[PDB]
Design a protein around this nucleic acid. Structure first.
Ligand SMILES: [K+]
Ligand SMILES: [K+]
Ligand SMILES: [K+]
Ligand SMILES: [K+]
Ligand SMILES: [K+]
Ligand SMILES: [K+]
Ligand SMILES: [K+]
Ligand SMILES: [K+]
Ligand SMILES: [K+]
Ligand SMILES: [Mg+2]
Ligand SMILES: [Mg+2]
Ligand SMILES: [Mg+2]
Ligand SMILES: [Mg+2]
Ligand SMILES: [Mg+2]
Ligand SMILES: [Mg+2]
Ligand SMILES: [Mg+2]
Ligand SMILES: [Mg+2]
Ligand SMILES: [Mg+2]
Ligand SMILES: [Mg+2]
Ligand SMILES: [Mg+2]
Ligand SMILES: [Mg+2]
Ligand SMILES: [Mg+2]
Ligand SMILES: [Mg+2]
Ligand SMILES: [Mg+2]
Ligand SMILES: [Mg+2]
Ligand SMILES: [Mg+2]
Ligand SMILES: [Mg+2]
Ligand SMILES: [Mg+2]
Ligand SMILES: [Mg+2]
Ligand SMILES: [Mg+2]
Ligand SMILES: [Mg+2]
Ligand SMILES: [Mg+2]
Ligand SMILES: [Mg+2]
Ligand SMILES: [Mg+2]
Ligand SMILES: [Mg+2]
Ligand SMILES: [Mg+2]
Lengths: 184, 261, 126
RNA sequence: UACCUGGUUGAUCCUGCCAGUAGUCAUAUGCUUGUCUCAAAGAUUAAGCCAUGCAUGUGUAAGUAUGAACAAAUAGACUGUGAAACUGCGAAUGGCUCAUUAAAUCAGUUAUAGUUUGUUUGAUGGUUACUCGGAUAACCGUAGUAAUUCUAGAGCU
RNA sequence: UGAUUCAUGAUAACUCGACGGAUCGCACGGCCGCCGGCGACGCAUCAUUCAAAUUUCUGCCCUAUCAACUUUCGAUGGUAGGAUAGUGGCCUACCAUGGUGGUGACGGGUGACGGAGAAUUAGGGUUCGAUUCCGGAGAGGGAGCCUGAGAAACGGCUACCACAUCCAAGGAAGGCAGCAGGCGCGCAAAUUACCCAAUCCUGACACGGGGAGGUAGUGACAAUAAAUAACAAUACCGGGAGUCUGGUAAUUGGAAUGAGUACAAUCUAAAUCCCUUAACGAGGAUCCAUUGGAGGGCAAGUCUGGUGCCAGCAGC
């Protein structure tokens, strides 16, 4: 026996059933270019995650509203959606979970929030800043564009202390240019 | 197999030990002793996983080989010694003394005791019969044998055992109206008042227990352990006092704690 | 060069092993890491240790992004108690013991060669 | 995602299948491959055959030291450490594999008032003896055989 | 005790009974030679624990081109024995003629170990389940057995059969479906590495040992995150004469940065990788993205050259 054999792992996306549907290809490319995604895989995993959330809500809604499992897990699901900024305190019902869309999840990405908070010039500029270790969520540097920000953490997005844009020393391009200028 | 198995695979260990599945291929194989291997807590788990005194398997051996740990008043040096329900664990250097009791979620809890309360324990009587020379004796569910017991003691009763004199100080008859704890099954760790006894000839006897909050649950006679006469237990219980809360109620407390804490 | 604050948590005094054990939090802005040697020189002052050799720090992990590390520390009442309860490899790191170089595979082949001979000749079997 | 599309006719509506579409902790193979984490891996055919090495040994204050052993001491049985050897225990666990096996194995559920069980734990064992006897190992020294933890005889304890 | 002429007692005898301590460490004390402490190891009995053995009920794929099967030599049951740890045709003697079967016996097939489970699943379902957890079974094929609490043991023995090693030819020694490795077989699968540091197991044992197990190497089985550029100014081209906004260029600019490399520290049993970090590290940022397609199904050319029912394409 190897202990490592007991480590779990799973899949995070499914490919479309119809690969060459022109309507779908048009809608997906619009979301990919709007949010600066790397490929269709990034959009497919968000759809995969959304399907899981909606499926959980549908099962709960099919039970009696007095069912203890309906009450307990329903509150947990609503609490989870509120903590990430998907739902509002005025939408505290499982029926509002079924009304969520892919755009709601893509708007909570770190890449989207870095752009819509003014830190970046374009959605594609935010992508490079995140992966280049210029952003931090609170005290922690985050270099994953797919990081899903929480409502309690959205106000702490700032430049990293080690970045040239956050108080750190200038990068190696300016430093070399300064060195060359000094040599003159 | 051609004989006795000496290994316990980690995933086959009892769940109430709460061992991490990636911590290794093996779990401590409980030694033979007063308690069954599935209803015990080996000293290695207690010293390393519960109390954190030892950081590794090796350090538990060092602690025990210095004769610093006692179970039921006697020093124990076996790492996998099966300490079980109602056992008293004492560590003189740290001046600590615990009683192994189940929490309401069915897991062993090291309930800190006072020096006065650490001088006895409760045992459940298994049977009473005549031994050699017609001398009556009783044996318990913790492997103990007591000769010349009180003639009033019968099977399923509870006896108060003094760990110094090693004698029966007092006993409780098994009857409806006493406070009992569940020691096995789904309701393990729950405390209530024995309300009814349903006997079925040739089959297991069912006992209906009612919680202090009116919640009623059933179980088998073999999983019941009388704690006191009437409604007051003879031993100190943990904070929950055997009250099992619903997940909704438990979530309510957690939410309130974050608001205050 | 900046300040280096050391914080400890999950602290407990272990009478059974005659030591203090705790988790070490090291804030080191502007620095790659903090060497274990320097942490011993700083823990000996925060806990008033007469001989730093009774200090053992191990399992250090620098957090992603830098500026903070976490480890585990042990303070022994004396170097004598350390040599009794401390594993050999952690004593070699602190210089309290030497390393005996050996080959396990060679030891096994010597064992199998030595059990074909009886008596005092077992050792002389080359 | 409770979904279908091409193909029989001059054209039509059907039956009906072929083909396409998607997945597989599903294997192989092709081409390609920068970074992080995680991770299966001589099962399928041959439970076919195997060179070599290794995978099981074991010492406490507490069974037995006269190494012609070491160390430190200096008329004593021994009583610092201790190789070897006897004795004790273990090697029936683990690991590997899926050949045979179809109410059999196995699963849930029972029973032993139908038995055995080193060990652990608890309890329990009557109203020459100031200590018996003979052996044997290590050791020692005569050896045999091409040869093996193959083997004979002698002297000790 | 649901239930036992049961637990257990008394009595008459019986046995040629491995039973009832000829053992060891430490500490020295108290009485006037006597007495005495705390331990170790061992014998026996019961209970307990660790388990096994046997066992109740229900449940298994395809096949009837398998309809009868079992019973002299046990098939089904009875009585008395023998054997066994013990129940039992388990075996023997004697007796009876039963037992199973379209509710599929019996026989045959399985590229059939069983289960926990795996894949896909609106629901129902279909398929798979050699493999790390549990149970069983085996150690080249059979059989037999010693030791022992426990084995019909194979990193134990004995024999036969099949293979095969050494030999001075008189003999002797063999069992990788353990780990690594080799041959063969194949569509098909890695190092003859390091270590007991973790997990745990074992011994007289706090200390020895552990190819169990872990660590590293090989590794596009499978899975996760995620680079291969961003921005501004020009030229050019649009949209809402005009001017704001958007799009292109191996143009021009300064900025950003990890792949890589490397002091160091950290990591580790020791190393290594990761994480952290001095220095270094991008313009055609050659630091060059590939694999399949472009009649339809089915996203994408009635472009250009070649070939001319050839060569080829084409799942249809
Ligand atoms: K068995
Ligand atoms: K044995
Ligand atoms: K069963
Ligand atoms: K079955
Ligand atoms: K029998
Ligand atoms: K009979
Ligand atoms: K034995
Ligand atoms: K180890
Ligand atoms: K050990
Ligand atoms: Mg086994
Ligand atoms: Mg019963
Ligand atoms: Mg369907
Ligand atoms: Mg036509
Ligand atoms: Mg088809
Ligand atoms: Mg890197
Ligand atoms: Mg021996
Ligand atoms: Mg068959
Ligand atoms: Mg059956
Ligand atoms: Mg009787
Ligand atoms: Mg009979
Ligand atoms: Mg007969
Ligand atoms: Mg099958
Ligand atoms: Mg088969
Ligand atoms: Mg299987
Ligand atoms: Mg097979
Ligand atoms: Mg395998
Ligand atoms: Mg198995
Ligand atoms: Mg076998
Ligand atoms: Mg073979
Ligand atoms: Mg055999
Ligand atoms: Mg073998
Ligand atoms: Mg074996
Ligand atoms: Mg392969
Ligand atoms: Mg490239
Ligand atoms: Mg073309
Ligand atoms: Mg088209």
């Amino acid at each position: 026996v190897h202990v490592s054999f007991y480590r779990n792992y799973g899949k995070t996306f499914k490919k479309p059933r119809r690969p060459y549907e022109k309507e779908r290809l048009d809608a997906e490319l619009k979301l990919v270019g709007e949010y600066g995604l790397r490929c269709k895989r990034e959009l497919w995993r968000v759809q995969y995650a959304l399907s899981r959330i909606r499926n959980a809500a549908r099962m709960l809604l099919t039970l009696d509203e007095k069912d203890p499992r309906r009450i307990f897990e329903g509150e947990a699901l609503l609490r989870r959606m509120n903590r990430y900024g998907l739902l509002d305190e005025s939408q505290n019902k499982l029926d509002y979970v079924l009304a969520l869309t892919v755009e709601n999840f893509l708007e909570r990405r770190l890449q989207t929030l870095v752009f819509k908070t003014g830190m970046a010039k374009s959605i594609h500029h935010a992508r490079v800043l995140i992966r280049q270790r210029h952003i931090r969520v609170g005290r922690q540097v985050v270099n994953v564009a797919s990081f899903m920000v929480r409502v309690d953490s959205q106000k702490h997005i700032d430049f990293s202390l080690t970045s040239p844009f956050g108080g750190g020393r200038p990068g190696r391009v300016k430093r070399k240019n300064q060195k060359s200028a000094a040599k003159k | 197999a051609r004989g006795l198995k000496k290994h316990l695979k980690r995933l086959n260990a009892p769940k109430h030990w709460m061992l991490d599945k990636l911590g290794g291929a093996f779990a401590p194989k409980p030694s033979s002793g007063p308690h069954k291997s599935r209803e015990c807590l080996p000293l290695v788990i207690i010293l390393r996983n519960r109390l954190k005194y030892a950081l590794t398997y090796r350090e538990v051996i060092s602690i025990l080989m210095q004769r610093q740990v006692m179970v039921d008043g006697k020093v124990r040096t076996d790492k996998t010694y099966p300490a079980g329900f109602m056992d008293v664990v004492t560590i003189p250097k740290t001046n600590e003394s615990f009683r192994l009791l189940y929490d309401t979620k069915g897991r062993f809890r090291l309930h800190s005791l006072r020096d006065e309360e650490a001088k006895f324990k409760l045992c459940k009587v298994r049977s009473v019969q005549f031994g050699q020379k017609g001398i009556p004796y009783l044996n318990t569910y913790d492997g103990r044998t007591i000769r010349y017991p009180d003639p009033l003691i019968k099977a399923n009763d509870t006896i108060k055992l003094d760990l110094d004199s090693n004698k029966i100080v007092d006993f409780i008859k098994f009857d409806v109206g006493n406070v009992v704890m569940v020691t096995g099954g789904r309701n393990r760790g729950r405390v209530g008042i024995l309300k009814n006894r349903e006997k079925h000839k040739g089959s297991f006897e069912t006992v209906h227990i009612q919680d202090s909050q009116g919640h009623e649950f059933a179980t088998r006679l073999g999983n019941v352990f009388t704690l006191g006469k009437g409604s007051k237990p003879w031993v100190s219980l943990p904070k929950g006092k055997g009250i099992k809360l619903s997940i909704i109620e438990e979530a309510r407390k957690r939410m309130a704690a974050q608001s205050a804490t | 060069d900046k300040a280096v604050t050391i914080r400890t948590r999950k602290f407990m005094t272990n009478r059974l092993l005659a030591r203090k054990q705790f988790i070490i939090d090291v804030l080191h802005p502007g620095r790659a890491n903090v060497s274990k040697a320097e942490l011993k020189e700083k823990l000996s002052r925060m806990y008033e240790v007469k001989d730093p050799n009774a200090i053992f720090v191990f399992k250090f992990r620098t957090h992603f992004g830098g500026g903070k590390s976490t480890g585990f520390g042990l303070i022994y009442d004396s170097v004598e108690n350390a040599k009794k309860y401390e594993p050999k490899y952690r004593l070699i790191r602190n210089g309290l013991d030497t390393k005996v170089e050996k080959s396990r595979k060679q030891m096994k082949e010597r064992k199998n060669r030595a059990k074909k001979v009886r008596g005092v000749k077992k050792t002389k079997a080359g």
